[PDB]
Structure formats: structure tokens, C-alpha cells
Amino acid sequence: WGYDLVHSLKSPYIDSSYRERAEVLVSEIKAMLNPAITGDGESMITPSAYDTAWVARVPAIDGSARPQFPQTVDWILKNQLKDGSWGIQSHFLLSDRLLATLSCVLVLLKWNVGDLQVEQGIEFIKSNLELVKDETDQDSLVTDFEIIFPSLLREAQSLRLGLPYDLPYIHLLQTKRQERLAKLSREEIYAVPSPLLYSLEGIQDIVEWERIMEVQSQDGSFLSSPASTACVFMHTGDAKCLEFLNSVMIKFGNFVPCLYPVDLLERLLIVDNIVRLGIYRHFEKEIKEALDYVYRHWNERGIGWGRLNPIADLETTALGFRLLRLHRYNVSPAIFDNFKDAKFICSTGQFNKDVASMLNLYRASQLAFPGENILDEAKSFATKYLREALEKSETSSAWNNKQNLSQEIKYALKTSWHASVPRVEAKRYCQVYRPDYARIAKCVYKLPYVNNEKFLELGKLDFNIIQSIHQEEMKNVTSWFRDSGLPLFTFARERPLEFYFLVAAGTYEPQYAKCRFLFTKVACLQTVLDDMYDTYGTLDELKLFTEAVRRWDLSFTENLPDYMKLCYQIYYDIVHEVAWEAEKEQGRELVSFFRKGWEDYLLGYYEEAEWLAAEYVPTLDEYIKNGITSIGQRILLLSGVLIMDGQLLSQEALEKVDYPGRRVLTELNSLISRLADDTKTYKALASSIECYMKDHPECTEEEALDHIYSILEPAVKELTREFLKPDDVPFACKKMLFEETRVTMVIFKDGDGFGVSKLEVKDHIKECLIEPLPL
Template sequence: MSLGCITPLASAMVGMRLPLHKPPPIHHNPFTKLYPSRRRVAQIPINMAFITTDEQGITRRIGNHHPNLWDDDFLQSLPKSYDAPCYGERAEKVIKEIKGMFNALPLHSSSADDLYKRLSMVDDLERLGIDRHFQTEIKAALDYVYRYWDDMNGIGCGRESPCTDLNTTALGFRILRLHRYGVSSGVLQQFKSKDGQFLYSNNQSNEKDLRSILNLFRASLIAFPKEQVLDDAKSFSTAYLKQALPNINNTNLSKEIKFNLEYGWHTNVPRLEARTYIDIYGDVKTSNSIFNSKLLELAKLDFNMIQSIQQRELQILSRWWTESGLGKLEFARHRHVEFYFWAAGGCIEPKYSTFRIGFAKMATFVTCLDDIYDTYGTLDELKVFTEAIKRWDFASLEGLPEFMKLTFKVFDEGLRDMAREAEKTQGRDTLDYARKAWEVYIDAYFQEAKWLAMGYMPSLEEYLENGKVSSGARVVTLQPILSLDVPLSSDVIKEIDYPSRFDELLCLTLRLRGDTKTFKAEADRGEVVSCITCYMKDHPGSTEEDALEYLNSLIDENLKELNWEYLKPDSVPIISKDHAYVLSKGLQLLYKERDGFSVSGIDTKNLITKTMIEPVPM
């Protein structure tokens, strides 16, 4: 989702209008693309694989994206094996049994590890993906722990422990903060020596010490801006765990550490964590107690039942995709299954089907529009197309290519459908509100198309101001959020939607993360304007490595601020923030190594197969 910048191709090859400013002299090779040099850009040969001529003889750029990986017949044949009522009945029975065990915990235990035990139970429920069934019990357990929390010293294993404990304090800090209890990261200062280094054991095969450092690492990821102790904790624990890994005899602890180091927090979506932790938990804890075996049984049942729901929704989405005709747009990325995975990785409540399917549709529209504006459309076409969308008038598309008419038709119908769903919850028509958001988004895309035609290289600030809109994060999130079963007043919407800082950070992290992973592939297609090239223009003599170092640091700081905006107390219903925030995590996951949408290769397919296709063995 980034810009293209091909002045000679724009005017001579793609049928675009002549540049508004005279471009630099063109060398003999007509197939050129522009590369950054202050406001203008220098020329390098364009890859001919990204040039095509349509049936009308218009030469266009294309992305050369690979086709859809998910055959509709395969999706329609998914068995939904855990649809039968007997599984739900068994799950309800196990839930009642687990609640009984929770409630049997004494209110004022004298156990030496009662605080750690409660925290560990909550942590297991959340990592296994079944915490939504036990919200009352979790609240009671955390209220109990918080009563004994000391903001200077943290807590020990039990409420009567004479000494604070790193493992319990780090685990407690993380869980309490994520549940919006007011806890300070300063509690971790006591575990540092006078020279500022964290105290630790040299015995890196000691399981207890390793688990303490692992929980310190996990705690360090839930950082707010300017929490130096958490930055220090992250650096220390990361290095310690990586060094310790070769010496760990416990295979399952090793797996747990590897998973946390690889996926951290911002790329660790709930469904992936649940599927991974079910395997780890099954090997480690089921022999410890009836409680643990019950948790594992419920986790497996719940995972498979949710998976059956997701498979049914995938079938609905795939039928919509086929019937919409969007598959005829051969130049566009066909990634509706990947978009569904993006939403379903964090939103698992059965009743939120509209959210998951709606998000996948909105993301599909964004991708089709992205490929039209970035590569396939000519500037003259895009001008008319933009004006037609902003008037929401299909008749205004007269004379435009069929691919634009089809995109507009399906896009407009999709927005209307989502507005009808949102009205059921919001009690009012939100179509005009959603359309205004899309109009701003389309303007941002058209601005990028004009930059392309002019051969203009914006500053990083100018690029990001436009890019946080053209990232599409707001428009793909807005209507699905409005479809949740929580009415949002206009004032409350503004705290999660534009112009809130929460919304701005979601959009910025999408733009920044996307550009850092896609700029090389997009440069091959002629789309050379990105955060990286704009930074290099602003800092003459800098390298790609310099730009990436700065931008990755900027992403880290934005994610810390996003943590704060997500967890701070305000009037926004938590469920709305939860679902918007977890969409950000899904994006971070799919852009973890590269653009997991444009190149939906084996890694992305394996994630989808693991979480949505293959059930957990019972």
C-alpha cells in the first residue's frame, strides 16, 4: 500500500496527463522509474515484468501479484467437525466445573503461593484462549492480588511472603496492567543492582530462574512511553533468554521461550497463542491437577468449536467473493481469506460474525482500490473515479473502464450492507458517517496518484500526514467496530475513531510497518515513494539502513503510545478498543517478516491452516 512514482511512464506509457512540472531529462530507455533525490528523483530502469497492455491498447503498470491461494471448492468442503450440539454441551459442563474450582479458592488463603497461583490461573486461561468464559472469576482473582500489591515493592508468591518475588511481580505487573489496574513499572527497579543491571542467576538451566526472566520479558512488552526500566528489562531478558536457549533441557519450556521471543506482544494474536499454548500446556501441566486437565479439555473443545464457526464464515465470504465478480480483476491482489484471518485471529466471540466478515470485505475493497490507484489506473481515469465516489453516483462512471465500474458497484453495496448491520446496534443510520471517512481516504489516494504523475518526492512529514489516511486502517476498522453490540455516541466514537490519537496511532503503525517491509518489492514495480525514500530525501547522504533504523525506532515508540491509548481509562467501551487494538496486532503479525498480503506465501498459509483449517487433536 504505498505510492508509485514514474513520471515518464505516467505521461508516455500509462496514458496519464503530462506532468504539472517539467520532469528531468529522459534518457533513451523509455521504461524508467524515479528514485529519490531531494524533491525530484533520479532514473533507473523499470522492470518490464510490471508493464502490460489492456484490451483497449492502454499500457498500464501491474503488481504481478500471485493469484488467490484458496480454492473455493476446498473452502466449501471444510467439514466444520465441531458443529454438533454435543460439543457445546460438554464445554458448558466443563466450564461449570472449572468455575466451581475457582470459587473453591479461599478468600483469605494462608498458602505460601496464593498470589502466584491466582495469577498463574488467569494467565493460563488467557493464553489458552478461554478467558471470556471466566470474566467474573478473573476479576475476583485480580482484585484479590491487587489488594496486596505494593507500587514500590510489588508482591511475593503469597500475601504473607516476607520478600518480593521477581516471577510473581513481573507476571502480576503484566496481567494487572493489561486489565487496566493502576500499576507502576517502578516495581521492577528493586530487581536491579546499584550499577543499574538486573540481578540474575548464572545458572541458565534453572527452570525457576528462566521462568522469572521469561515473565520479566513478557512484562517489558506492555510498556508506555518513557518507561526506561521496561526498556532495560526488555534488553536484558531478551539477551538472557537467547543465550540460555541452547542449554535448556525442558523441551516445552524451550518452545514457550522461543514462541514468546518470536511473537512478543504486538505480533501475538490470541488464536495463534492459544493454538501454540495448547500443545505446550498439554505436555507440561495436565499431570499436575484435575483443574489443569479440565482447562486443557475446555481449551481444545473451545478452539475446535470456534474453528467450525470460522470455517462456516469462510464459506460465506468465499461465496460472496465469487458472486461479487471481484475475482475478475486480475491486476488486483485476491486476499479475502488472509483478511478474514486478520480479523478472526483476535475476534473469536461467535456472535461477532458481522465484524469478522465485514472487516474482510472492507479490507478487500481497500486492496482493490489500492491496486487501482497505485498501479493500474491512469490519472485521467482516477480523477473521474475519485469524483464519482465522492458523489456516490454510479452514473458518473460513464466512459470509465469496466474494472472501475465493477469495483465501485461492489464497494458501494458493501458499505450499504455494513451500515444496515451497524444500524441494528447503533439505532441510527451511520452510512453518511462511513462515507465521509471513505471520501477522505480516497482523496489521500488521489493525492498520491498526483505525486506520481508529477514525479514529486514529499518530505517524510508530508508523506506520513497523507499516508496515515491512505493506509486504510480507519476505513477498514470503522464499520466493523460500529457493528459490535455496543452503542457508541458521537462523542465516544471520536475517542476511538478520527480525530483521536488512538486512531492516528493505528493508522501510523500500519503505514510505517507496511513501508519497512514492502519498499524493495514496490520499488521493483515503480512505487518508489515510501517512508524510507522520504527519510533519505530529508537526510541527504543517509542510507536505507539509516532510514530503517530510524523508522523501526519510531514504530516502537508509536506502539508504546498505542499501549497507553489502549489501556488508559476513558469512556470508550473496552470491547470496541479491544477489537480495534487486536486488528493492529494482526497487521503487525502479517507484516512481521514481509508483506504477508501481497506475498501470501507458505508462512501465511501455515498460520491460516494451523488456526482455521486443522482442528486440535482431542
């Protein structure tokens, strides 16, 4: 550990050639995304054999005995898989292959073509249906499979195709179809758009086609489904239906996907993945362009996966809410009212979509601002949903197991956005992100703009480069520390890497080296000052030191004990080095401001020192008042935030984030740090818990701990708002303050009082700063 460990590190990723390579990757990705974000190449989605077969059914509008879109028949004839099914070869999902294959067989028969493909298709369906022994063999189900497959199979039955219609699994599907159809309000089908519009081809006996046009989408589709739209067209001859089908053929050529467009969801997924991979700083322009488009279509009724959907989609809406708010767009949690009743619903559609909607709801709820009760309700609801999902057999399907769904749900539930280490989360996501990820709707599909090899290549390389740069900084840190004189204070533990980690794990960009360095110096000094005032020094000694603090005079130290003479000299040097660097960056005088800050901090220590000597137990109000100042976070944060390369803070701007006595960023961080620290420790000078109990002699320790949390939770919401709030404060500065708070909250998470785990601390440093990602 310390000096020897860090100086043993020799990372190759520091060479400029790696950053040059990363820049090529950035350019390639910008080129790849351009059609999606700026051009007309939006909605890049794979073919749906199932939907293509429905479109292939449409007869020529000229009344001749041939398909209107003969290219779709040719596509089907040419795209059968080796095993006789149709679908995406890389991923096998039984329900997807069954549905698509039966769909293709029937249309080939309609047009009396593809005898061999038909024979092979029928064989696939028959043989695979006969492998299903019990329900747990069916695997994950494509959207509305239980509704559609029985009706498609009855079509085959009327043609007397050689299929096993009398299998128990077939009877069970019909049973499930009835169960679904029973809860259907049929009169409302025509009045209120609903998810069933996505699958009208499966409920043809139920729908009055003469009434269905009222819930048609503006583009002529029925909930963006080519199959569902083709079905309505063949029943009605509706001109807008045909226009939608034409538009998809024009876009894709000789096939159609199972959803179109996916313009909103796709843009949000691109942004989400770029952000989670930790590579967002390279794509500011593209992310803004993507979210600007989503925001244009953001409305009080929520959003669908496509901008023309006549009903909102929880998955897309919750994802949009989170990304928009995170990028400082003004959105209101009242949009979640669109997904309520009587509260929340979303337990109807296909399983993966439902789970995705709730994971997104859960994540969105953590971005709550003060007074947003709907998000508290949302969090509770989504948590309960996800814990229940873990216990469902569907979660353990072959398909879901292959994608580690249960693991993903568990990770989300144990992970608090506020108590997260940013660099570590990006590192972990690089290890989970899948370039060839397959999604489920009416069929299995992929979105190559979202899931691709380049994103991951850049993610891993960028992480390694940043880490190698930090490793070189850590050599500088440990080298400075060794010669600094701080090691002479043997009453204080040496923690330079822990303090470096505190800032570096969140403020990681290469240009902020000085910020990280000075922040680390101040934190090392403070841990000595803290031990000196609250443990090692006597009140008479500490009184002398505190007088020296007032005087700012090196000559005055002749009065101090030897160890304090040294401590004062180091303190004085660090304060003024920081001040000099701040004045250089800011272009204005800051020595007096820093000096006042240090005086207030240490006078806070002295007040505490007086309390300790007197065995005085403060009121909670007194404890918190002192603690916000003496916890030391304010002056530490100032020693980093004012020295960020290129980030100018006027007095006016600074007061928006730093102002003793006001609930601004530095004050909230101080309060959160003090109380989170207490909740985590205190059981291992009185703490906030003990103080409250002196204030309320009758109350229990349990009540006391609950009260501290009742203070913490509101503070965290305020911190989030202060961070994300639109204003003219350089965002990099707000983010540095916020991210330092997040890492602090990681250190003190799950406050039971038993103390901080040193092994967890070292493990975080290992993961973040020491061990590279394998390439």
C-alpha cells in the same frame, strides 16, 4: 484454496451438542476454582516429604518423649515409595528424592520407629549417590540443595549411618556450599529479609537464633517454609513459629507442603493459564475476583508468592505486573526497582525459578507504555539473561529436557506479544500445556488448580468449536465473493480468506460474525481500489472516478470507463450495506460519517495517483500525512468496529478511538500499518525510506530504515496504552482495533525490506482456520 477448499470443510464441532458439552466443562471448572478464589481452599499444593519430616522432628511441647505432631510420623511411615525414597511418584528428580529421603530417615531414627523404612531409605540414598559419575549427572537441583544436603548428610555421619560420605560428588557439594556461603552478608541476615530464610535448617551453625526473629513473617513462618520454621521453633520455642506450624497442619491434616501459602502466585498462575489457553472469556467473573485479590496486596515493594512474604519475588511480581496491566488495573513499572542494585540481579536462587522470573520479566516488559524506560532496560536485561541461559548446562538437564525448557525459552525469545496471532497462540499453547506439570522449590510439587485435565479439555474443545464456526463463515465469505463482481477485476489478486483471517484470528467470538463479514467485504473492495489507483488506472480515468466519489450518484457513472462503472456500483453497494448495518447496531445516523470517511480515503489515493503521474517524491512528513489516510486501515476498522453485536459507540466514545489528526487507536494502527509495511517491503511510488533519503541526501539507507523504526516503536507503545487505558469505551471495540493491529504486525514482522512471505501467510491461515486440534 478459496471457494473449493473452504466448501470442502465439514466440521462436526458446529453441532450444538459440542457447545453444550463445553458449557458443562465451564461449570465444572468454576466449581473447581471456587475454593481457591472465593472460599478458603486456597493454596492447593502437594505434600513435601522433606518438610513433613522437619515438622515431625518437633518434640511435644508438654515435654514428653514424643512428636508434637505425631500424625506427620504416621504419614511418613505410610508414604514411602516402592524404591525406598519419598517424593511424588509421577516425577523422578534425584536431588528431590535424596533430600526428602535423608530427611525422612533421620526423623524416623529420632523417634526410634520405622526400622524397615529406614533401612530401605538408606539403601536408596547410598545406591543413587553411587550412580552419580560426574556433575552433569546430578540433574536439576531443588532449592538450596547445595547448602542443605551437606549439613543433613553431616547429621547422618554423626549417627554413623552407612552412607558413602567420601564420594567426590559429596565433596563437590561441600565445595559449592562454601562458594554460596562466602557471598553471604551474615550481619544482614538479621536485618534484611533474604531468600536464605527459606532454608535456615541448612545453616544452623551460622544463625544466631536470638536475633533471627526480626525477619520472621507476620504469620510466624520463615519465608513460608515449614521446615525452616520448625527449625527455628526447636531452637527458640517461639510462639508464632508454633502457630504457623499449627496452621499448616490444620489446613492439610497430616503433611505439609514446601511453601505456604502460595495465595498470590497460585491465583496469578490460574489466570495466566486460562488466558494462554484462550478460554478466558468464559471466566470473566473468576479472573476479576482473582486479580482483585492480587491487586489488594499489590504494593510499592513488590509481591511474594504468598501475601505474607517479607520480601518480594521477581517471578510473582513480574507475572502480577503483566496480568494486572493486561486486565486494565493501574500498575507502575517502578515496582521493578525492588529487584535492582548499584541494575537488575536475580541470579541467585534455584535455576528454574531464576529462569521463570526472567521469562516473566521479558513478557512483562513488552507491555510498556510511553516513557517507561525501566521496561526497555528490563527487556534488554531479560533477553541477555535468557540467551545466556540457553547456553548453560543446567538448561539441558534430564528434568529440563523432559519439560522442553530450552524450546520454551527459544519460543519466548522469537515471539513478540505485539506481533502475535491470538487464536494461533492459544492453539499452540493447547499443545504445550501439561495437566500434570511439576514445579521445583524445596521439593518437587504440583498446583492442581493451575495444572489439570479439565483446563486442557476445554481449551481444545473451545478452540475447535470456534474454528468450525469460522469455517461456516468462510463458506459464506467465499460464496459472497464469487457473486460479488469483484473477481472481474483481474488486475487485482483475490484474497478473501486472507482478509477474513486478518479480523477472525483476533476477533473470534461467535456473536461478532457480522463484524467479521463486513470487515472482509470492505477489505476485498479496498484491495481492488488500491490496485486501481496505484497501478492500473490512468490519472485521467482516476480523476473521473474521484469525481464520482464526491457525487455519490449512481447515474453519474455513465461518464466512467466500463470497468469503473462496475467498480463504482460495487463500492457504492458495500459502503451503504455497511452503513445500514452500523445504523441498525448503533441506533443513530452514520451514512454521512461513513461517506466522509470513504471520501477522505479515496481523495488520499488520488493525491498519491497525482504523485505517481508526476514522478513526485514527497517529503517524509508529506508521505506519512497522506499515508495515514490512504493506507485504508481507518475506514476498514470503522466498517467492523461499529457493527459489533451489543457494543454501543456514541459519537463521543467513537472519537476516543477514532479521530483523524490525533494519536488514537485507528490513527496509530494506520501509521503502524503504513510504516511496518514499508519496513517489510520497499526493497521489493516511493516508500518512507526513500522519502527520508530525499530529505537527507547524505544519510544511508541503513540510517533511513533506523529512522522509520524510531517512529514505529513509540507508536506501538502508544497503541498499547490506548488499548489498555481505563475509560468508558466498550472494551470489545478497543480490543477489535488492537487485535487487528497485532495480526497486521505479524504479517509485516522482521522488516528487512525483502517483502512479505506468501507461504507464511497461507501457513497462518492453515493453522488458525483450517486444521482442527486432535482431541
